[PDB]
Design a protein around this nucleic acid. Structure first.
Lengths: 94, 110, 67, 71
RNA sequence: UGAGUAACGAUAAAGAGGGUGAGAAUCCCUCUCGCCGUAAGCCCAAGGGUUCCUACGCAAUGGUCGUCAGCGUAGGGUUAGGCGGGACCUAAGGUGAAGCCGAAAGGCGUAGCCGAAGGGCAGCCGGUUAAUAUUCCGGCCCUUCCCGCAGGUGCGAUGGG
RNA sequence: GAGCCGGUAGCGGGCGUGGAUCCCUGGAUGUCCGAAUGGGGGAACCCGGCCGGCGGGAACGCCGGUCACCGCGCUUUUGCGCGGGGGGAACCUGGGGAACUGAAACAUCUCAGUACCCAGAGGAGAGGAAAGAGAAAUCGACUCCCUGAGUAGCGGCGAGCGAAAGGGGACCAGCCUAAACCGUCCGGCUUGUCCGGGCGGGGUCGUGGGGCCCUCGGACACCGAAUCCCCAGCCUAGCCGAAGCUGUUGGGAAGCAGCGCCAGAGAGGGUGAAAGCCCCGUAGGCGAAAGGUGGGGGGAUAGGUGAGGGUACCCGAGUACCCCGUGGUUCGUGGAGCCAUGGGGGAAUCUGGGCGGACCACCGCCUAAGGCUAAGUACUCCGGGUGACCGAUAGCGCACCAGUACCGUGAGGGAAAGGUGAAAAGAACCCCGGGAGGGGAGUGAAAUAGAGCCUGAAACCGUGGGCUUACAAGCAGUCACG
């Protein structure tokens, strides 16, 4: 319901490298506007938004055996703000 | 055997079994009846790993499925279930007067 | 919690209409769990979502009380 | 709808059949016209007051014109 | 059933060492041949929707094994101020306020719009990734446009030229 | 009523008789889509306005509302309320309109206004207040039945198709509009008096109404949505509810035994092998509450009607009649009724004008040309029930992760396969070996029932054995002797 959150963290080696600079890997809503992607990270999450890139992606690879299946809708969005902070609370597993 | 079922976790001897001499049940369950006479296990050789107890043929097995309880032990074995004395407001308890006159009641028991 | 709704029954406007936002956030926290905690939390995530609805609802349904 | 009388209708089902007759006379010849066809009326209008078409349809117009003229 | 005979998608031919692994003429490395080379090259655009990358997997399928594999188990992973297209355009064609017609569904089409390698329309090199990339980083670069400022100004409709 | 967090068993937990599940009813957001509606456009894409709201104000996006399109209602201030429009298995009515086949040809005929296509329709439709009818000097909506003969009927009198009256019975209701005629108020008109707007009266019913006069009227008929309420019933959930043990073989028993009961409920299905009384919320009977819906019953609502006589006259589509054209109705012109409409012409008010029976008469009936009309058959996609109807290559083609895969560009067509077994306790370890697999175990009453599995044959492939067979011609083989 028009709520702020739009995303979940992504986990690449590069994402792990993402914090060396501040790129930010997020599974996201399949229709988020960059600005939302701006503001969401903003008042919901508190930065000076800078640099964004984003990826729609159709789902990848599965079976069960007796019938057929392929992975459902998915999407990515990436970003890095100037100050060099935030999400340091959120990189924590690696 | 649907959303409606039968006996509570209960206390009851049974008959045909090769075990007869029952009493407390353990845990009644859904469409497959599923409850425990707390008599007769088997083994199941629960693999081998220590996540299992390490040298299995495990010991707790209690799923003698069919309904067959000689229900409840108030002072009687098997009975029909009549219904309820009620009296007090929204009371039922479908307390069984059949020979013995009890519901295996929530008051006295489970 | 027998009475999850009562305070929710109580709140009348934005004070909730904002509170929910934070209260939403409390569940925003719950997606962070790719593998940070995710233990007993699996309930903690669950019906905490449910209240939100009512928070929608009561807003809605008191906006129905409103109209 | 279109080409009815406008007040009413002439879009008739049209069946066409005949041959040759020879009957009150004596002998009888052959003919038969087990077939279908078409058969229909006429367009044209005039005026209400000021700047006007009309349209409507054929035979009634000989009556038809005056009614509006009678308003 | 005929048949282990026919067949094996090309007459453009590799060898051997070394390893690997339960088990290798086919698999990984070395070496030497061979052949392309006016393509069996690199590149984009239709095609299609996964491989590609890593580990284990061997019965499956690969027309043979096959520790290999475009096959499997799951995970991995490409985002554009300017690359292409869309927020511009419009031919035929299509569309359809009108307008005028059909047994009935229909007919056409004025005006405008829809619809391309057409047209108009804002850059480029190197670098590092397992994988992508002129959109990631570096350098350089110009961008329609907004506000705020200066300055000048006759300005203002896709109306007519 | 109290254990659960779909099919799926794991995997990590929880919430719980201070109802959660589960069902039932109204809730409230319901992405995108599609008649499709802000605007286009390759369905699941996109591009805005016009308001108010977030983002760092606006330059950039999000929010919610509103942004056709017809046709009407009219409020004839650029618009308002209000109308539809989409389908949907069948369903019928219109409108449309097909052959071969049948004629052992076949063009007339036929099948047949079928099939199909649209249009429309509502849960029914359509018809339905008599210019009947046919023959008593009738009857009085109709349709549905069956009868009414398939006679009476029609034609290349070929094959055919095929009534109605009557009779029985089903349900068994009928009323609204134009009448300058008057009033009315209103519009135009223009000097009033033509037409047009509403309102009254009438607006019929079967020959009456319109008007003047006289007796007149002193009220019952209930609604064919007249209106609402009430018994109103499904919906849903339900609750009962009777009552055997003991013994016994037995892999397992409710079978055998013995002794017992039950009952307005010995239907059925189930529990390890056959239960009237173990279970099945089995049927006897009873619920249910507020809703969400409605015939019977009931009431009030009764709009809407609810006297004869007098004078003559102003009254159901101007267009019916006729002619040539085709249509139907059993009716393809035969003389050709009727209703239909094709064109063509063209009259009038109950002194009518049509009828029935070519045509005339005469006889008698009927009073046409603006509409809604129930309940009555039909239909069964949905629900429920039912079973000399069906068993897994029968039954829809389909019985459970299908009309989905597959194939066919698309139009389409159109798969195969059910059951292990008391439950899984579905096989721990043991060893061969890469692994699968196989053996032991032990599991289990049966694993030669262990997952391509109840039980499993058919040919077809083997061995193990038995018997014979290497100098003979023979479908086969049968008989005779060894």
């Amino acid at each position: 319901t028009a709520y702020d959150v739009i995303l979940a963290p992504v986990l690449s080696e590069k994402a792990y490298a993402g914090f060396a600079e501040g790129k930010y890997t997020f599974w996201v809503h399949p229709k988020a506007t960059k600005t939302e992607i701006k503001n969401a990270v903003e008042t919901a999450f508190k930065v000076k938004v800078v640099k964004v890139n984003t990826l729609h992606v159709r789902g990848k690879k599965k079976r069960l055996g007796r019938y057929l299946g392929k992975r459902p809708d998915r999407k990515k969005a990436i970003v890095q703000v100037a100050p060099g902070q935030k999400i340091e609370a959120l990189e924590g597993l690696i | 055997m649907r959303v409606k079922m039968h006996v509570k976790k209960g206390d009851t001897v049974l008959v045909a079994s090769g075990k007869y001499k029952g009493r407390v049940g353990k845990v009644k369950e859904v469409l497959p009846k599923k409850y425990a006479v707390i008599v007769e296990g088997v083994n199941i050789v629960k693999k081998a790993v220590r996540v299992s107890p390490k040298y299995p043929q495990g010991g707790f097995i209690e799923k003698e499925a069919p309904l067959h309880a000689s229900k409840v032990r108030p002072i009687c074995p098997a009975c029909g279930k009549p219904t309820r004395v009620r009296k007090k407001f929204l009371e039922n308890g479908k307390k069984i007067r059949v020979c013995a006159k009890c519901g295996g009641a929530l008051d006295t028991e489970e | 919690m027998r009475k999850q709704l009562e305070e929710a029954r109580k709140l009348s406007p934005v004070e909730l209409e904002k509170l929910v936002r934070e209260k939403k956030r409390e569940l925003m926290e719950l997606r962070f769990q790719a593998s940070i905690g995710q233990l007993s939390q699996n309930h903690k995530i669950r019906d905490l979502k449910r209240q939100i609805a009512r928070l929608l609802t009561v807003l809605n349904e008191k906006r129905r009380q409103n109209a | 709808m279109k080409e009815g009388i406008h007040p009413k209708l002439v879009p008739a089902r049209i069946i066409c059949g005949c041959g040759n007759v020879i009957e009150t006379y004596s002998t009888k010849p052959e003919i038969y016209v087990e077939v279908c066809s078409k058969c229909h009326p006429f367009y044209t209008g005039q005026q209400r007051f000021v700047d006007t078409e009309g349209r409507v349809e054929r035979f009634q117009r000989r009556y038809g014109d005056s009614y509006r003229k009678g308003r």
